[PDB]
Amino acid sequence: QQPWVEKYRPKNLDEVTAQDHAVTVLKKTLKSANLPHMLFYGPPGTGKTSTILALTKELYGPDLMKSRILELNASDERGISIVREKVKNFARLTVSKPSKHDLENYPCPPYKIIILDEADSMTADAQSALRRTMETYSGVTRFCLICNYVTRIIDPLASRCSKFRFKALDASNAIDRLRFISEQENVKCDDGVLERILDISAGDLRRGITLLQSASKGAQYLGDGKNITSTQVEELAGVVPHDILIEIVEKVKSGDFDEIKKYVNTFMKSGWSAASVVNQLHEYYITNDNFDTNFKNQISWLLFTTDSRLNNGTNEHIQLLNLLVKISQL
Amino acid sequence: SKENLPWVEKYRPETLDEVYGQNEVITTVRKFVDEGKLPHLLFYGPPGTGKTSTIVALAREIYGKNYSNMVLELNASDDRGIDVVRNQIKDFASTRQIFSKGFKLIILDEADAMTNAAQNALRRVIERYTKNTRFCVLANYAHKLTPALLSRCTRFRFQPLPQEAIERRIANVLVHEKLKLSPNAEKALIELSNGDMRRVLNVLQSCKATLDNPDEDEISDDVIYECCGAPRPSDLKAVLKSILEDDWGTAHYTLNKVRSAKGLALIDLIEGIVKILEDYELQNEETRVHLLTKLADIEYSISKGGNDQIQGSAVIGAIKASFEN
Amino acid sequence: MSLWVDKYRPKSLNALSHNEELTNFLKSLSDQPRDLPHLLLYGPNGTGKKTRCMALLESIFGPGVYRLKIDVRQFVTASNRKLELNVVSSPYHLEITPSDMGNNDRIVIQELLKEVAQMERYKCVIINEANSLTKDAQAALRRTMEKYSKNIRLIMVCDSMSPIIAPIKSRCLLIRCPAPSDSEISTILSDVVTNERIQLETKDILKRIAQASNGNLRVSLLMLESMALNNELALKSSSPIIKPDWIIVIHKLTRKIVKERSVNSLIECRAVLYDLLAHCIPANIILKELTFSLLDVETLNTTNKSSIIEYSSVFDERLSLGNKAIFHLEGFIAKVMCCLD
Amino acid sequence: LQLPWVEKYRPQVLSDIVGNKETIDRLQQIAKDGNMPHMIISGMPGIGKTTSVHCLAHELLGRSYADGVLELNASDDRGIDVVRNQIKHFAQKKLHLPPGKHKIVILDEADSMTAGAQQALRRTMELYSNSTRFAFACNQSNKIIEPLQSRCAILRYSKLSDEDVLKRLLQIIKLEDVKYTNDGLEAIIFTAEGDMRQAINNLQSTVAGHGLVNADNVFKIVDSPHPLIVKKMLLASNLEDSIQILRTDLWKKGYSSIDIVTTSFRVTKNLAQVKESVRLEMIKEIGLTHMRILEGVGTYLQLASMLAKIHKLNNKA
Amino acid sequence: NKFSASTVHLEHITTALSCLTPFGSKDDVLIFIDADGLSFVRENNHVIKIQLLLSRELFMSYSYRNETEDHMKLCVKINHILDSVSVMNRNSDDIVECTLSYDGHGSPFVLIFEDSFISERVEYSTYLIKDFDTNGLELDRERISFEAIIKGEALHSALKDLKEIGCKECYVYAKTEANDENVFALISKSQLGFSKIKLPSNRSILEKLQVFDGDSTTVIDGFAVIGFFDFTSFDKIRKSTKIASKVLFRMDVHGVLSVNILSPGIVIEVCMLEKESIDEAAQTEIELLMET
Amino acid sequence: MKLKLIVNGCEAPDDYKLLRTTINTVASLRKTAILRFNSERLTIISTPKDTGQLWCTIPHDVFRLYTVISARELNTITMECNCDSLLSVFKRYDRVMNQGSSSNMTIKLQSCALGITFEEIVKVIMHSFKVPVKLLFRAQDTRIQEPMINYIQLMMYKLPPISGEFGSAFHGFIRRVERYSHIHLMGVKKKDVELKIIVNELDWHLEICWNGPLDSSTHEVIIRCKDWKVCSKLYAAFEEVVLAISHDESCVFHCSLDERGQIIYYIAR
Ligand SMILES: Nc1ncnc2c1ncn2[C@@H]1O[C@H](COP(=O)(O)OP(=O)(O)OP(O)(O)=S)[C@@H](O)[C@H]1O
Ligand SMILES: Nc1ncnc2c1ncn2[C@@H]1O[C@H](COP(=O)(O)OP(=O)(O)OP(O)(O)=S)[C@@H](O)[C@H]1O
Ligand SMILES: Nc1ncnc2c1ncn2[C@@H]1O[C@H](COP(=O)(O)OP(=O)(O)OP(O)(O)=S)[C@@H](O)[C@H]1O
Ligand SMILES: Nc1ncnc2c1ncn2[C@@H]1O[C@H](COP(=O)(O)OP(=O)(O)O)[C@@H](O)[C@H]1O
Ligand SMILES: [Mg+2]
Ligand SMILES: [Mg+2]
Ligand SMILES: [Mg+2]
Q: Domain locations in chain A?
A: 1-169, 170-239, 240-330
Q: Is C305 within the bounds of a domain?
A: yes
Instruction: Kindly state if the Cβ of D198 falls inside 6 Å of ligand 3.
Output: no
10 Å Cβ neighbour count for C221?
Answer: 23
Q: From its phi and psi, is residue D43 left (phi > 0), alpha (psi between -120 and 50) or beta?
A: left
Interchain CB distance below 8 Å, D66 and E280: yes
Nearest to A125 among B113, B205, B314 (CB): B113
Helical (H) or strand (E) element with E204: none
Please give the Cα distance from E282 to E269 (Å, whole number): 30
CA of A135 to the centre of ligand 6 (A): 8
Domain count, chain B: 3
Interchain CB distance below 8 Å, E191 and D66: no
Question: Which one of D188, D208, D224 terminates a domain?
Answer: D224
Same domain, D234 and D218: no
* Helix axis angle, D226-234 to D257-270, nearest 10°: 70
Please give the Cα distance from E95 to E89 (Å, whole number): 7
Same domain, D147 and D14: yes
Same domain, B95 and B188: no
Residue B138's φ and ψ, nearest 5 degrees, are: -120, 130
| DSSP letters spanning B235-261 | HHHHHHHHHHH--SHHHHHHHHHHHHH
Please give the residue of chain A at the shortest CA–CA distance from C159: A271
Please give the Cα distance from B106 to A313 (Å, whole number): 49
Nearest to B90 by CA among B128, B35, B52, B54: B128
Task: Spell out which residues of chain A touch residue F203, defining contact as CB-CB under 8 Å.
Answer: 89, 93
Residue F72's φ and ψ, nearest 5 degrees, are: -95, 15
CA of A52 to the centre of ligand 1 (A): 11
A151 labeled part of a ligand binding site: no
Q: Is C311 within the bounds of a domain?
A: yes
Can you tell me whether residue B174 is helix, strand or coil?
helix
Please give the Cα distance from F268 to F227 (Å, whole number): 10
Non-local CB neighbours of A225 within 8 Å, separated by 6+ positions? none
Question: Which one of D175, D198, D224 terminates a domain?
Answer: D224
Contact C27, A221 (CB under 8 A): yes
Can you tell me whether residue E214 is helix, strand or coil?
coil
Same domain, C61 and C157: yes
Same domain, B2 and B135: yes
| DSSP letters spanning A99-127 | -HHHHHHS---SSEEEEE-SGGGS-HHHH
10 Å Cβ neighbour count for C326?
Answer: 13
Kindly report the CATH number assigned to the domain that includes residue C58. Answer: 3.40.50.300
- The amino acid that residue F83 corresponds to is C
Same domain, B186 and B134: no
Please give the Cα distance from B163 to B186 (Å, whole number): 10
Please give the Cα distance from E278 to E189 (Å, whole number): 12
Contact B122, B150 (CB under 8 A): no
Same domain, D2 and D131: yes
Contact A158, A37 (CB under 8 A): no
Angle at A122 between CA A120 and CA A126, to 5 degrees: 135
Same domain, D52 and D152: yes
Nearest to F176 by CA among E24, E7, E88: E88
Most E CBs within 10 Å, among A92, A96, A114, A137, to test the E interface? A92
Domain, as residue range, for B200: 162-230
Same domain, D141 and D15: yes
What is the CA C6 to chain-centroid distance, rounded?
Answer: 16
Q: Identify how the structure was determined.
A: cryo-EM
Can you tell me whether residue F207 is helix, strand or coil?
strand
Burial E130-158 (b: 16+ CB within 10 A, else e): eeeeeeebebeeeebbbbbbbbbeebbeb
Atom of ligand 4 nearest to the CA of C45: 22
CA-based torsion, C31, C36, C42, C45: positive or negative: positive
Angstrom distances, CA of residue F84 to CA of C250, F14, F23, F132, F136: 58, 21, 11, 10, 17
Domain count, chain C: 2
List the beta bridge partners of residue A114.
A70, A143
Please give the Cα distance from F222 to F184 (Å, whole number): 6
Nearest to A281 by CA among B269, C311, B313, C173: B313
Question: Which one of D160, D194, D216 terminates a domain?
Answer: D160
Q: Counting beta carbons within 10 angstroms of the beta carbon of residue E248, is it exposed (0 to 12), middle (13 to 18) or buried (19 or more)?
A: middle
| DSSP letters spanning D251-282 | ITTT--HHHHHHHHHHHHHH--SS-HHHHHHH
Q: Is C1 within the bounds of a domain?
A: no
Burial A44-80 (b: 16+ CB within 10 A, else e): bbbbbbbbbbbbbbbbbbebbeeebebbbbbbeebee
Nearest to F93 by CA among F67, F61, F64, F125: F125
Contact D157, D49 (CB under 8 A): yes
The resolution in Å comes to 3.2
10 Å Cβ neighbour count for A197?
Answer: 28
Contact F149, F266 (CB under 8 A): yes
Can you tell me whether residue F222 is helix, strand or coil?
strand
Domain, as residue range, for D276: 225-317
Choosing from A9, A27, A173 the residue with most ligand 1 atoms within 8 A of its CB, the one to mutate for a pocket test is: A9
Please give the Cα distance from B316 to B310 (Å, whole number): 10
Kindly report the CATH number assigned to the domain that includes residue C325. Answer: 1.20.272.10
Contact D135, D69 (CB under 8 A): no
DSSP state of E212: B
Nearest to E152 by CA among E6, E292, E260: E260
Please give the Cα distance from C51 to C217 (Å, whole number): 11
Contact E48, E270 (CB under 8 A): yes
Task: Spell out which residues of chain B touch residue D258, defining contact as CB-CB under 8 Å.
Answer: 141, 143
Nearest to F210 among E90, E117, E124 (CB): E117
Angstrom distances, CA of residue D222 to CA of B29, B156, D170, D203: 13, 7, 21, 11
**Residues of C annotated as binding site for ATP?**
5, 17, 43-51, 218
Same domain, B123 and B219: no
Same domain, B190 and B113: no
Please give the Cα distance from A109 to E127 (Å, whole number): 18
Please give the residue of chain C at the shortest CA–CA distance from A76: C110
Same domain, B134 and B3: yes
Reported as half-sphere exposure (CB side, CA atoms, 13 A), residue F249 has a value of 9
Interchain CB distance below 8 Å, D4 and B157: no
Residue D156's φ and ψ, nearest 5 degrees, are: -110, 130
Same domain, B254 and B269: yes
Q: Which long-range contacts (CB under 8 A, 24 or more apart) does F101-110 make?
A: F101/F8, F101/F9, F104/F6, F104/F7, F104/F8, F105/F5, F105/F6, F105/F7, F105/F8, F106/F4, F106/F6, F107/F3, F107/F4, F107/F5, F107/F6, F108/F3, F108/F4, F109/F1, F109/F2, F109/F3, F109/F4, F109/F134, F110/F1
Choosing from B43, B138, B197 the residue with most ligand 2 atoms within 8 A of its CB, the one to mutate for a pocket test is: B197
10 Å Cβ neighbour count for D134?
Answer: 22
Please give the Cα distance from B102 to B99 (Å, whole number): 9
Same domain, B198 and B252: no
Q: Which residue stretches of D129-238 are H helix?
A: 146-150, 162-176, 182-192, 196-210, 215-221, 226-234
Q: Closest Cα to atom 2, ligand 2: which residue?
A: B19
Please give the Cα distance from A302 to A304 (Å, whole number): 5
Nearest to B219 by CA among B160, B170, B157: B170
DSSP state of E55: E
* Positions of E strands within chain A: 38-41, 69-72, 112-116, 141-146, 162-165
10 Å Cβ neighbour count for C4?
Answer: 21
Same domain, C36 and C166: yes
Instruction: Kindly state if the Cβ of B316 falls inside 6 Å of ligand 2.
Output: no
Nearest to A215 by CA among A199, A202, A196: A196
* Positions of E strands within A133-237: 141-146, 162-165
Please give the Cα distance from D313 to D275 (Å, whole number): 11
Contact E75, E291 (CB under 8 A): no
Same domain, D220 and D237: no
Domain, as residue range, for C307: 245-340
Distance in Å, alpha carbon of A258 to nearest chain D alpha carbon: 37
Please give the residue of chain E at the shortest CA–CA distance from B87: E45
Question: Which one of B161, B186, B217 terminates a domain?
Answer: B161
Please give the Cα distance from B79 to E143 (Å, whole number): 39
Angstrom distances, CA of residue C113 to CA of A83, C125, C145, C170, D13: 22, 9, 10, 21, 71
10 Å Cβ neighbour count for F162?
Answer: 7
Interchain CB distance below 8 Å, A149 and D296: yes
Q: Closest Cα to atom 9, ligand 4: which residue?
A: C48
Same domain, B216 and B250: no
Domain count, chain D: 3
CA-based torsion, F216, F220, F226, F230: positive or negative: negative
Please give the Cα distance from D81 to A82 (Å, whole number): 31
CA of B52 to the centre of ligand 2 (A): 7
Atom of ligand 4 nearest to the CA of C23: 1
